[PDB]
Write a protein that binds this DNA or RNA. Structure first.
Lengths: 470, 436, 436, 470
RNA sequence: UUUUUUUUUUUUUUUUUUUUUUUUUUUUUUUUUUUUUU
RNA sequence: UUUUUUUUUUUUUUUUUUUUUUUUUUUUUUUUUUUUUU
């Protein structure tokens, strides 16, 4: 059944919106100031810093960074008669802990935490990607497309684990492998057992993320190595560059600004009654009647800022630019010529230059965002009969495809990497930049609610560039 | 004696044909509409839904799917002056239960049920095979050839059990093994005892299906595991890939469209008097003078549709294409380039595009279809030790060994199996593989 | 080096004796009342009930048994002018926890806990053995000799694990096996993982306890069963009846009454300076000048009570009676004709009949008690194949093979193990069997 | 816990007593006629004939015995001004079925059925025992003492199965064995499977009933025979004559007349509140203030009739006469010189001779009736150590009891009967007619309620005869 | 030179027993009565 | 001469995918900034 999931997510987002309402009440902010992305961003880093129970425990025993008992940051932006001023207001965690507890009807609301931290990961992926760490581990900077959910820490649950990219897991596992290579950390102690456990948990997350059997089997065999040394490093680099084309089925969770939920809840649009969804039309129509204000530099233009905000909201920064333009209806400028900077404001930037203005989020169309893969990346081995059965009793040969019959019969010793790299190469050669994917699905219009009739898009606009970076 | 079996099957098919006659009388259909495969198909799903006593009991306690007290589906296709229209006419089970009871002279006619459900399994195997479930259990999609009788549920008897393929049994047993692995279901309760019983019944069906002693012995030893866990999974996968070449002696029951029997019975050809057979010339000669109409899409061609219908009728979709072409006399196109779709029509397809036309079922020759294996097999502690002999037998096996010595393809004019003609194909590598 | 171990055990027993001194100070008992075994026994059950942190946690969530917040029992026996009276004085755990903490110089003193709980196990084995549980698991009552350390719970450490008998481990493992057979308890959850872990810990304790390679290998192979069912039950019963003769190298820890340590510490005999040992002459010479008073029934005789107390102190209740008589110098009466009862007094017994008197602990000789096996062993796919060598070794075994070559019984006057005297018994069949 | 069992049995007997009250209301009987055993006896055969669902199904397809649609018997005895008259009033089952259903608050009350049918078995065992069938199977008439619960049919549950004697099970199993010998009835059909199942159910009931390991093991090995022929017949006869001395732990359920419960319930003594027990003081004190009237022949004396009724009530007809006399306080006459007949009245006996009078049920003492065995029938094998452990390191022999060491080491082939008959004979020879049993337990006085202090009985009255038959 | 882990109710009236356990149906029997007779 | 058993929610939009899944903590990092520098 799907009604229960819809009711649960509706209750969750209703609690989130009511917490936004109460923060607006408590902060004594104006109507316009309640529609600012920066305030929600700072408040949500406060949120994560209050539920980072592991870091809370680590910092209680580590009283450093000067005045840091329980309070961090808090750069609240406020308006005086047109001008803007930032105040470093410090909030302790504990009162906000109870205000959450009262906001979700006595519950912890950790799922909502996962969605906000994923949405921060989405905005981070949209704004800046780290080739710095990608080459710190030595991997080439060609794979920036697989840094989805990179900023997400381990503390997130299965829902958070679903949206993390393959490359994010590759980076996380290489970190552990390098740490275990630097020092003899895999001893029979509890630390070794726990890092072992986290390792197989991350690995079965990985093998769940993939779709074709060959990569699942080679991930299974990578596990066989009880002592991760150097060979597994290139083994999993080969895994990553195979997933470049044999991409994993990674979900795309549609989270929206802290305000958008608050404005919707304040108007009385209860999500429990009519139901809510995270993949369907829902986050699209809530943005159809949502007003958002944002802060812009004197050199920054708002036109690219709105598009980057739409990137962050719908996590479409790693998608084809042409498709995003089609749903937008307007051309989406790649990051090469974006005359804008990061959404977050540096702590040293002055305030006389800063100017607030609206953001455009309206899109002409809407589409479903499933956690599936392309329908043109399944070119491996073969598909058909191997044996025959005699139906008529006729004196005839029984055709047997012998060379594949030996291939099926082996020993299953669960040990090999290059031998499967051979099928990786074969499949890559079979792959083409022409194979059309997602057959049977299309882009839909806003006026339709039950997915009745789509329109098939068709682009012949040469080589405008389907590459957000470079 | 064989006369009694012939008389029994003749009486059964006579009752089936008379039931077809009475449904034609009751439905007020025209002569052409009585020769449509779709009507018989829908009526026979009604048939199975009326004798699915287990599902009847399960659905009486489960009133769901909206308006479903006793009536399901019923998309009857009718002609108005050339055009076609579907009506969703709902029939309850019980009256058709009594009409059967009167159609078989007071008997239940469960054997006929088995043959119709097998014929549905034959058409399903001809049209679509499920690698979906084959990889849901994780088995590779290379073994689509052993999905014979896959759609057949357990309710069929020994006659139904004979025609189910080895791979069908492998899938059914792996389903039970995975269910017993997910939860501790093998307790000393009645459910565990009954699933145990069904397990040995399916297993001695399996060991009866095989021919060589090694696989029979390893199936015997697979039984010795009182707690089916993970090792038996690969054990029986090895059994399956051994049966790929060491094939089991599975029968091929020759059932024909619901109409073909009805037209034959209506003309007065009593099968009890002259006798009837399910393996011999009989279903061949009844199709020699049978007229069949079918529904075809505006893009579908009837030429491949007739060949696919012959596949479904004679269950030759898993055989060599060359042999089927020889009996046909015309080339049989493999499924790779069939510009056609499934025989059954989707519930949402429009009717202005649909067009009805004849089907060709005439074949130049006829052959016996025994439940034997290739002559190549006659020419030739745990499970792994026997896997060793499996491997050496596989190595001894060759793609050259000719089978079925002493038997041949026959002509239509002969009735007593007097003199055959030996076929000989040297036409390179046209492709003896229906899939791929 | 052995000096560090001697210093550690000396410090431990010094702390124990000082705790005895302080309890004597706090309880306001007389000099005679401080030499009573019953008071020390009750105080030491208080000790175990205060460090049973597992049971403390289990009872804090389970407030039952009426008035049981933190206090249990406490039947202190006191003298009025010759007569005796018991008072049910209740002591809470926590203050005694801190008094221990101050008694061991800020340390927990868990090792001392292990030795006191082992000494309770020694007295329990000396007094009463449970064929009740031995036949509750169905094992025959012939193996009462392998119930050493049976009362010891799991909470003890490696030192406690060393002295537990083979049969005690057999009983503990069969309990877990029967619990896992009754319900599907071996799931992938944390409980299954932890019981698994405890299982291999108890099993490598077992295989460490044995000496011959065959039984170690069969214990190794018993481990290979991931699902302990019924076959392992008889497998480990065969292991036990093989250990009947192929006995395991189990230690014998020489703990002494709560008072004996207190009297020695009170007199100023510091054990840290001169060193202390648990296997050598030490516990023998401390009893050479120790006075002990005990409570005796009007029908009980003190002569057998002193011998039973010596059994409990030196854990010689499972040894040959002849040898114990030789070290005693007087005949040791077997349990068949002991006109005495258990040392502990029932909660309902009256006090007018109870009479206090001295106990004799002096022994003419002393001997080393190593954790080795008889020299007879040095003279000599599944479980059944190794059971074959078990049977042939049993047949090779004889009731004549003399053991412990090169070692002998020593005199008290010698301190450095200079010259022993070889004993020799030809006194027919007096009976080398404490039970029966 | 024992409170729940007490509450359940109290509710059950309260329902039984209320059904007795309603039958007294419906039958229009007088106060004296409601204290007659015969009326309750006939009504309770009506009870069993109404819940004998198996026989109901068998007789619906078998309309014989003349007028027998739903009604059987019903010889109700009534008083006219001192004289007595029997009326053959026929009651159908179904209305009494619903009256039960309303009497137990909507429940079937099958447990109460088991207790009434056991109490009928108790009275039958007290009155008449069948050496007729005992020699029909050919077994000697010396074992009449093991016919406890003989009349009980299979339909009773575990509670009914507990009180059936060892000899009753022997007779029931020999019946099945002779039936399977007469015809090839053990085929692979459903009938063979079901009789097989009933066979192991009766056999594990048997092995649960015994106490010593040898007989349990030989019962286990008797099971090994898949085809019960002739050898098992003498095998289980040997089992029976071994159980003659190695008696099985068979319970003694204390059921009382149909009226006694009704009179107690009518007076308002609710058993749910104060609790009820079936083994303790309870059935004793209810008889301390119970009045019972009974029918007696002109030649029968009431003095022996009261004692026989006490036999039937407390199922002490198979016990020592001396002990029963001690609890009675008066001498109990053995069946050899009882100038009385069966309690039930023959259908042809005239009514002018029949006379009604009181029955004495008062007993001077009370005792617990546990389902245990004698503490002097445990003389088998030996008890003591077999091995020794070296405590001191002394150069000495290790005494091993070798001939028993071989005895323990065998093969466990689960096949033998005479070899264990050898230990049967050895144990029988070790057994003595002097061994005192039931140590630590004694006879109690009525005034005590919590089992405080007993008095030890002691009989030196020569050989009065501890044998009810003969 | 070898070591403090916790998972839903037990035990000191005492020394080898005693203890939260259950409605299945297959071809003709039985209340003249208590150990024979069919 | 070889045979009608029933156990808690599936399937005809279509031909080889798509679907009721979850808060763990171990010795010093990061919002001056967007792909280097430590």
């Amino acid at each position: 059944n799907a009604t229960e999931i819809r009711a649960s997510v509706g209750k969750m987002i209703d609690g989130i919106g009511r917490f936004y309402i109460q923060m607006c009440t408590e902060l004594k902010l104006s109507d316009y100031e309640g529609r600012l992305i920066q305030n929600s961003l700072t408040i949500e880093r406060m949120v994560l810093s209050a539920f980072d129970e592991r870091r809370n425990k680590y910092l209680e025993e580590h009283p450093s960074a000067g005045k840091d008992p329980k309070k961090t940051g808090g750069p609240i932006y406020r308006r005086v008669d047109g001008k803007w001023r930032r105040e470093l207001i410090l909030y302790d965690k504990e009162e906000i802990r109870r205000i959450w507890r009262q906001a979700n009807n006595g519950d912890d609301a950790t799922a909502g935490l996962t969605h906000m931290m994923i949405w921060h990961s989405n905005l981070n992926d949209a704004t800046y990607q780290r080739t710095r760490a990608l080459v710190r581990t030595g991997m080439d900077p060609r794979m920036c497309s697989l840094m989805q959910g990179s900023t997400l820490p381990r503390r997130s649950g299965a829902a958070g684990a679903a949206v993390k990219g393959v490359g994010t897991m590759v980076m996380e596992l290489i970190r552990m492998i390098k740490r275990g290579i630097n020092d003899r950390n895999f001893w029979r102690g509890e630390n070794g057992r726990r890092t072992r456990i986290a390792y197989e948990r991350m690995c079965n997350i990985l093998k769940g993320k993939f779709q074709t059997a060959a990569q699942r089997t080679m991930v299974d065999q990578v596990r066989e190595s009880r002592n991760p040394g150097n060979a597994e490093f290139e083994d999993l680099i080969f895994l990553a560059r195979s997933a470049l084309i044999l991409r994993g089925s990674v979900a795309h969770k549609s989270c929206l600004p802290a305000c958008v939920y608050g404005s919707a809840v304040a108007s009385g649009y209860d999500f429990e009654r009519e139901g809510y969804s995270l993949v369907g039309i829902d986050p699209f129509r809530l943005l159809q009647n949502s007003q958002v204000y944002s802060l812009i530099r004197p050199n920054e233009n708002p036109a690219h800022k709105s598009q980057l905000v739409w990137m962050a909201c719908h996590s479409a920064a790693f998608e084809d630019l042409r498709v995003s333009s089609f749903i937008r209806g307007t051309k989406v400028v790649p990051r090469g010529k974006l005359s804008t900077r990061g959404v977050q404001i540096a702590s040293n930037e002055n305030m006389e230059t800063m100017e607030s203005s609206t953001l455009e989020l309206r899109s002409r169309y809407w589409a479903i965002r499933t956690r599936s893969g392309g329908n043109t990346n399944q070119q491996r081995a073969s598909s058909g009969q191997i044996s025959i059965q005699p139906t008529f009793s006729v004196q005839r040969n029984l055709p047997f495809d012998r060379p594949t019959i030996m291939a099926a019969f082996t020993g299953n010793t669960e040990g090999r990497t290059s031998d499967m790299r051979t099928e990786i190469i074969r499949l890559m050669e079979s792959a083409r930049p022409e194979d059309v994917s997602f057959q049977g699905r299309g882009v839909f219009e806003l006026s339709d609610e039950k997915a009745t009739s789509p329109i098939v898009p068709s682009f012949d606009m040469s080589n405008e560039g389907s590459y957000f970076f470079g």
